[PDB]
Design a protein around this motif. Structure first.
Motif, PDB file in Angstrom:
ATOM      1  N   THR A 107      32.090  40.158  41.035  1.00  0.00           N
ATOM      2  CA  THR A 107      33.038  39.135  40.994  1.00  0.00           C
ATOM      3  C   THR A 107      33.342  38.452  39.825  1.00  0.00           C
ATOM      4  O   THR A 107      34.358  38.255  39.198  1.00  0.00           O
ATOM      5  CB  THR A 107      32.903  38.508  42.481  1.00  0.00           C
ATOM      6  OG1 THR A 107      32.972  39.441  43.614  1.00  0.00           O
ATOM      7  CG2 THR A 107      34.116  37.445  42.557  1.00  0.00           C
ATOM      8  N   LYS A 108      31.981  37.808  39.724  1.00  0.00           N
ATOM      9  CA  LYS A 108      31.747  36.765  38.436  1.00  0.00           C
ATOM     10  C   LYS A 108      32.289  37.332  37.118  1.00  0.00           C
ATOM     11  O   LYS A 108      33.025  36.909  36.203  1.00  0.00           O
ATOM     12  CB  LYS A 108      30.514  36.247  38.300  1.00  0.00           C
ATOM     13  CG  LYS A 108      30.203  35.479  39.811  1.00  0.00           C
ATOM     14  CD  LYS A 108      28.821  34.866  39.241  1.00  0.00           C
ATOM     15  CE  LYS A 108      28.165  34.088  40.697  1.00  0.00           C
ATOM     16  NZ  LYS A 108      26.760  33.839  40.513  1.00  0.00           N
ATOM     17  N   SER A 109      31.913  38.613  36.919  1.00  0.00           N
ATOM     18  CA  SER A 109      32.037  39.281  35.717  1.00  0.00           C
ATOM     19  C   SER A 109      33.614  39.817  35.525  1.00  0.00           C
ATOM     20  O   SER A 109      34.098  39.310  34.496  1.00  0.00           O
ATOM     21  CB  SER A 109      31.484  40.743  35.699  1.00  0.00           C
ATOM     22  OG  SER A 109      29.902  40.697  35.760  1.00  0.00           O
ATOM     23  N   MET A 110      34.418  40.259  36.699  1.00  0.00           N
ATOM     24  CA  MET A 110      35.659  40.589  36.464  1.00  0.00           C
ATOM     25  C   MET A 110      36.408  39.422  36.379  1.00  0.00           C
ATOM     26  O   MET A 110      37.436  39.154  35.559  1.00  0.00           O
ATOM     27  CB  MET A 110      36.164  41.059  37.754  1.00  0.00           C
ATOM     28  CG  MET A 110      35.773  42.716  37.686  1.00  0.00           C
ATOM     29  SD  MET A 110      36.424  43.721  38.918  1.00  0.00           S
ATOM     30  CE  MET A 110      36.288  42.975  40.385  1.00  0.00           C
ATOM     31  N   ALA A 111      36.069  38.102  36.928  1.00  0.00           N
ATOM     32  CA  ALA A 111      36.667  36.755  36.756  1.00  0.00           C
ATOM     33  C   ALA A 111      36.499  36.399  35.254  1.00  0.00           C
ATOM     34  O   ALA A 111      37.498  36.138  34.503  1.00  0.00           O
ATOM     35  CB  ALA A 111      35.906  35.723  37.490  1.00  0.00           C
ATOM     36  N   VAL A 112      35.094  36.476  34.537  1.00  0.00           N
ATOM     37  CA  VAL A 112      35.018  36.022  33.377  1.00  0.00           C
ATOM     38  C   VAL A 112      36.050  37.049  32.196  1.00  0.00           C
ATOM     39  O   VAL A 112      36.583  36.534  31.285  1.00  0.00           O
ATOM     40  CB  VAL A 112      33.788  36.118  32.905  1.00  0.00           C
ATOM     41  CG1 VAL A 112      33.374  36.054  31.511  1.00  0.00           C
ATOM     42  CG2 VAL A 112      33.051  34.864  33.661  1.00  0.00           C
ATOM     43  N   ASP A 113      35.769  38.321  32.565  1.00  0.00           N
ATOM     44  CA  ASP A 113      36.420  39.336  31.621  1.00  0.00           C
ATOM     45  C   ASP A 113      38.239  39.224  31.904  1.00  0.00           C
ATOM     46  O   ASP A 113      38.589  39.564  30.653  1.00  0.00           O
ATOM     47  CB  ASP A 113      35.940  40.698  31.844  1.00  0.00           C
ATOM     48  CG  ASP A 113      34.398  40.909  31.332  1.00  0.00           C
ATOM     49  OD1 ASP A 113      33.888  39.901  30.458  1.00  0.00           O
ATOM     50  OD2 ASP A 113      33.856  41.799  31.645  1.00  0.00           O
ATOM     51  N   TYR A 114      38.552  38.714  32.731  1.00  0.00           N
ATOM     52  CA  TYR A 114      40.040  38.939  32.976  1.00  0.00           C
ATOM     53  C   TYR A 114      40.860  37.860  33.204  1.00  0.00           C
ATOM     54  O   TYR A 114      42.075  37.590  33.352  1.00  0.00           O
ATOM     55  CB  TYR A 114      40.293  39.950  34.123  1.00  0.00           C
ATOM     56  CG  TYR A 114      39.918  41.343  34.123  1.00  0.00           C
ATOM     57  CD1 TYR A 114      40.670  42.183  33.076  1.00  0.00           C
ATOM     58  CD2 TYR A 114      38.865  41.773  34.535  1.00  0.00           C
ATOM     59  CE1 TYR A 114      40.210  43.419  32.709  1.00  0.00           C
ATOM     60  CE2 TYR A 114      38.280  43.126  33.836  1.00  0.00           C
ATOM     61  CZ  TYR A 114      39.277  43.873  33.193  1.00  0.00           C
ATOM     62  OH  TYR A 114      38.759  45.157  33.013  1.00  0.00           O
ATOM     63  N   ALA A 115      40.062  36.671  33.096  1.00  0.00           N
ATOM     64  CA  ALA A 115      40.729  35.327  33.180  1.00  0.00           C
ATOM     65  C   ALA A 115      41.892  35.012  32.105  1.00  0.00           C
ATOM     66  O   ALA A 115      42.766  34.537  32.404  1.00  0.00           O
ATOM     67  CB  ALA A 115      39.592  34.075  32.948  1.00  0.00           C
ATOM     68  N   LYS A 116      41.709  35.604  30.958  1.00  0.00           N
ATOM     69  CA  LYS A 116      42.534  35.303  29.947  1.00  0.00           C
ATOM     70  C   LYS A 116      43.843  36.192  30.034  1.00  0.00           C
ATOM     71  O   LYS A 116      44.770  35.936  29.426  1.00  0.00           O
ATOM     72  CB  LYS A 116      41.893  35.715  28.682  1.00  0.00           C
ATOM     73  CG  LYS A 116      41.827  37.373  28.314  1.00  0.00           C
ATOM     74  CD  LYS A 116      41.027  37.413  26.858  1.00  0.00           C
ATOM     75  CE  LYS A 116      40.903  39.140  26.547  1.00  0.00           C
ATOM     76  NZ  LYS A 116      40.286  39.183  25.374  1.00  0.00           N
ATOM     77  N   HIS A 117      43.765  37.053  31.119  1.00  0.00           N
ATOM     78  CA  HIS A 117      44.931  37.887  31.702  1.00  0.00           C
ATOM     79  C   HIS A 117      45.358  37.396  32.865  1.00  0.00           C
ATOM     80  O   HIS A 117      46.454  37.957  33.400  1.00  0.00           O
ATOM     81  CB  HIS A 117      44.277  39.280  31.753  1.00  0.00           C
ATOM     82  CG  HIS A 117      43.970  40.006  30.366  1.00  0.00           C
ATOM     83  ND1 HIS A 117      45.038  40.478  29.519  1.00  0.00           N
ATOM     84  CD2 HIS A 117      42.869  40.370  30.004  1.00  0.00           C
ATOM     85  CE1 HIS A 117      44.141  40.879  28.516  1.00  0.00           C
ATOM     86  NE2 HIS A 117      43.190  40.651  28.909  1.00  0.00           N
ATOM     87  N   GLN A 118      45.309  36.414  33.128  1.00  0.00           N
ATOM     88  CA  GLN A 118      45.728  35.439  34.549  1.00  0.00           C
ATOM     89  C   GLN A 118      45.633  36.571  35.707  1.00  0.00           C
ATOM     90  O   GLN A 118      46.155  36.382  36.550  1.00  0.00           O
ATOM     91  CB  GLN A 118      47.286  35.133  34.302  1.00  0.00           C
ATOM     92  CG  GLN A 118      47.326  34.155  33.148  1.00  0.00           C
ATOM     93  CD  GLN A 118      46.409  32.795  33.284  1.00  0.00           C
ATOM     94  OE1 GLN A 118      46.301  32.207  34.320  1.00  0.00           O
ATOM     95  NE2 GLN A 118      46.017  32.520  32.238  1.00  0.00           N
TER      96      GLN A 118
END
Lengths: 255, 255, 255, 255
Positions: free
Chosen positions: C165-176
Motif C-alpha cells: 500500500t505504502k509503496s504504490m502510494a509513493v510510486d504513483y502519487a505523481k500520477h494522481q
C-alpha cells in the motif's frame, strides 16, 4: 571492548532508584563515570555509600528547575572532565482519569516527565555541540506507543518523550549527537510495586502475576534488563542508530 | 561476559558476504560457533579458508528449498551440538514498478526474502521448542516500515518480515524463544554498490554521495553497524526484548 | 452529496460475501457502479440475481491467475467505461503455527492475500496511468500492524499488504493515483463465525463473547462498519490521503 | 443521511481560522450546530458576521485557563442543548532549537497544544459521561508521528496529543465515547504562509513550491481536506473506529 564505554561520562536523571539505579550499576560496571541527578538527598547518599565507587557522583537536582538542570550538567563536566551521554530517566506516574484529573497533577506529570527532559537536554546539548559529539537516551515507555489504561497524563507525557527523541535526533544528527529512546514495558521496581498495590485488588504476588500475564514472555521485566538496553544505546554497538525507539516489553506491543 | 555469546551456536543465512559476513566476524569475535548457510559454495568455502577459525562452518543452502533449510539446521546441531540463534539475513532486491513487474520476479523476491525466512524458522523452531529456548533475528529493512521508492516488491516482502517477526515472537514467547528484527537503512556493501550503479546515473562515488545525503547522519551505514545490532539481539543484553524492530538507519525513519 | 460517489466505477475483489458484499451494498447505495471479481460463479450469479441492479456486474475471477486479474480489470472498463477505484479485499485465513505449517498452505495464504493484490493492482494501474488518476484501497488487517495469535502466515501477508500500500502510494502519487488501506479488527461475518467454531471449543455465542472482550469497544465490528471506511477512502473526502492506514478495530491497536 | 450529523452539537477549539474554520463550514453544511472556542474576540465576531448562521455560536476562550474551558463546554450545552462532539483543534507553532529554546516558549507550546486539549476534554467528558455517549476528535500532526525539522517543542506536543487520543479512547470506550485524531501534513492556510515567510528565504510563492515538493502528491493540503476527515470521524461512518490516527499528508509519512 566493542561497547567502548570505559572513561565515558554518563549523567543519569532519576538514577538513585529503580531502572535509573540499575543503569548506574551497569555503567559503573563498564568503567564509565556516572553522575546521578535526582531529587532525594538521603536516597542519593545511600546509593553513593552502597556503591563506594570513585566513578560515581551524586548531584541533588530538581529537573523541573532550569538552573538545577544547568548545574547538573556542569557537575558532570567539573567532576569527570566532560559529558558523553545524558540519560533522561526521571519520570513519575499519577493515576487519574482525564475527567477527574487536577490541573496541578497533570502539570506535575508533564513537568517531570517532559519539561525536565527538555531542560536537561538543552543544557547537555550546549556542551555536546561544543564537544563535537554526544549521545542522549530518553526513557520513554510502552505508554508512548500505545495507551496503558488509567494513566492518560503519563501516556501523553511519553508520547511527548517519543517525539522529542525523534526531533532531537533529526536536528542534531549533523552534529554527531545520537538521540534514542527505550520503551520499557512493565518493570518490577519498588515504585511500580507501590502502584500495583494502590491500583489493583489482591496481594502483591497476585498482582505481579496478573501484570506478568499481559506480556507474551509471561514475566515482568527486571530493571537491569532496561539498563542493558541503555548500555547498548550509549555504546558504539549502536553507532548507526539515531531517532530509534527500542521496545523492551516482553512482547507487549507485538500483540 | 554480559553478552554471554561464548559457545552459543549461531546459524546465519546469507552469511558469506555483506552484512551477513560482518555478523560472522562479530559473532566469532564473541567466541560463538557460527554456521553460515548461503547459496554460493565457492564463496562460502573461500570465507572459511580465509577465516581459518574452527568455530566457523559453512553449509551450502538454498533457503527456498525446505529440505535444504532442514539440512542447514541439522548441520548446526551435528557440527556444534545445538542451535541457539538463527539469523535470517538472506535477501534479494529486484527493482521494478508494480505496473511492469513480472510475476516471476515478484515471486523470486517473496520466495527468498519471506518464504525462505519461514522455512528456516520452521525447522529452527522445531529444534528450539525441544531445547526449551532460542532466539531468532530477522533482517527486515527501513522498507518494512516506510516505502523506499521504486522497490515495491522488496518493501512488501519486508513488511511480511516485520509481521512474521512479531507473530513468531507472540506465538513462541511462552517457550522462551525470543524473536526480533533489525531494520537497516542504506548500508554500504559491495552488493548495494551494484544496485547503486545499475539504478542511477553517475559514477559509483557520485551515487554514494547522493545516497548518503538522505539520512540525518549524512552517511551510509557500514555492515558492521548492522552486525553489532544483531550481536545485541542475540546476547543476553536484550533478554526482555521480543517482537521488537530495531531501526539502524542514521535517522532515516525519524523524519 | 459530499462523498460524491455517484457514477464512479468500483472493482471489488472478494465482493460476493462478507465485508466485500457489505461494500457492494454500500457502494450501490451511493449510486456507484460496482464490479465484483470473486472466485465462485454460482455465488456471484446469485448475488446479481438478488440485487437486480444494473449498476452491478459480476466477473468470475481467480486473483492468483494473472490473466484472470487482467480480465477483471478489462471487464470493469468495458462494462462501465472506466475504472475509478480498485478495492483489493480478497483474502483467506489458514490457522497453523510456523513450526508445523505446510509450505503449500503458507504459499496459498501469500498467493491470495498478497500476490493476488499485486496482480490486480498491476493491471488496474495500467488503466489508471492512462486515465490520469485512480484510487486503490487495500484490505489490510490489525494483523498487518500487530500479530494476531496463531495466524502467523496471515499476519505476514497483511504486513506485505501494508507495505505494498505504502509503496504504490509513493510510486504513483505523481500520477494522481491515491493508495490507502483499511485495517479491520475482528469483524462478525458468517465466514469468521465458521472460523470461530472450527478453531475454538464452545458455542458460537460463547466464542463471540470472548472475541468481543479483547477490544476497548467490547464488541465485534459489523461488516458494514468496514464498508463505510471504504466509502470514505473512495470518496472525495479523502483527497489529501495517500499511503495511509485507517484502523477500524474498536480500539484494539490503541492498547 | 449516512453521516447523521444533523442537529449534533460540535465544539471546535481554534475554530475561527484555518483548518478550524474549514471545519466550522463543513459541520454547518451538515446542519450540525457549531460552537467555536477561540482566543481572539474580534476574529470570532467577524467569523460569526460572515457565516450569518443561527447554528453557529462563538465563545471567546483561552483554553489554557480551566475556567474558560469549562465555560466553553457550558456555552455549548446552554446554547444548543447538549454536546455531541469536541474537536480539539487549537495549536501553535514556535520555531526554536532545543539548545536555545526559552522555557517560557516551550511552556506556551505545550500549554496550548496539549494542556488545553486536556482541560477541554476533561470538561467535555464530564458532560458526555452524563449524556451516555460522545466523540472527541483531536488535531494531531505528521509531527506526532515523525519529526518535522526545527520545531521540536511542536513535535513533542503532538506526540502528546497522539497518546492522549489513544488514552481517552481506551479509557472511555466502555462509555460509548469514541476518540480519534487526524494527522495533517503541510496545509495551506494564511497562518502557515506567515510561518513560511518567517522561516525560509524567497518569495511566498517560491517557498510554497518548495514545501509542496516534499510530499508524494506534490502539493500542499487545503484546510477543507482536513475538515472532511473530521466530518468522517464525527459521523456514524466511523462507528467502529476509536483510538485511531488518520494521516492526511499527501503521502509524507509513507516514505
Amino acid at each position: 571492548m566493542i561497547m567502548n564505554l570505559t572513561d565515558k561520562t554518563v549523567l543519569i536523571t532519576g538514577g538513585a532508584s529503580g531502572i535509573g539505579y540499575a543503569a548506574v550499576q551497569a555503567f559503573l560496571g563498564q568503567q564509565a563515570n556516572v553522575v546521578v541527578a535526582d531529587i532525594d538527598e538521603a536516597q542519593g547518599e545511600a546509593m553513593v555509600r552502597k556503591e563506594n565507587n570513585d566513578r560515581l557522583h551524586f548531584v541533588q537536582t530538581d529537573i523541573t528547575d532550569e538552573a538545577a538542570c544547568q548545574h547538573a550538567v556542569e557537575s558532570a563536566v567539573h567532576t569527570f572532565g566532560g559529558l558523553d551521554v545524558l540519560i533522561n530517566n526521571a519520570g513519575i506516574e499519577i493515576v487519574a482519569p482525564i475527567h477527574e484529573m487536577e490541573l496541578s497533577d497533570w502539570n506535575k506529570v508533564l513537568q517531570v516527565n517532559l519539561t525536565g527532559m527538555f531542560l536537561m537536554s538543552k543544557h547537555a546539548l550546549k556542551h555536546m555541540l561544543a564537544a563535537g559529539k554526544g549521545n542522549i537516551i530518553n526513557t520513554c515507555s510502552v505508554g508512548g506507543l500505545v495507551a496503558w489504561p488509567d494513566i492518560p497524563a503519563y501516556n501523553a507525557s511519553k508520547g511527548g518523550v517519543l517525539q522529542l527523541t525523534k526531533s532531537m535526533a533529526v536536528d542534531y544528527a549533523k552534529h554527531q549527537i545520537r538521540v534514542n529512546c527505550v520503551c520499557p514495558g512493565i518493570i518490577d521496581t519498588p515504585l511500580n510495586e507501590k502502584s500495583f498495590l494502590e491500583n489493583n485488588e489482591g496481594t502483591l504476588e497476585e498482582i505481579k502475576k496478573e501484570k506478568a500475564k499481559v506480556n507474551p514472555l509471561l514475566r515482568l521485566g527486571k530493571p537491569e534488563e532496561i539498563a542493558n538496553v541503555m548500555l547498548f544505546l550509549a555504546s558504539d554497538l549502536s553507532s548507526y542508530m539515531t531517532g530509534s525507539a527500542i521496545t523492551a516489553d516482553g512482547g507487549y506491543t507485538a500483540q
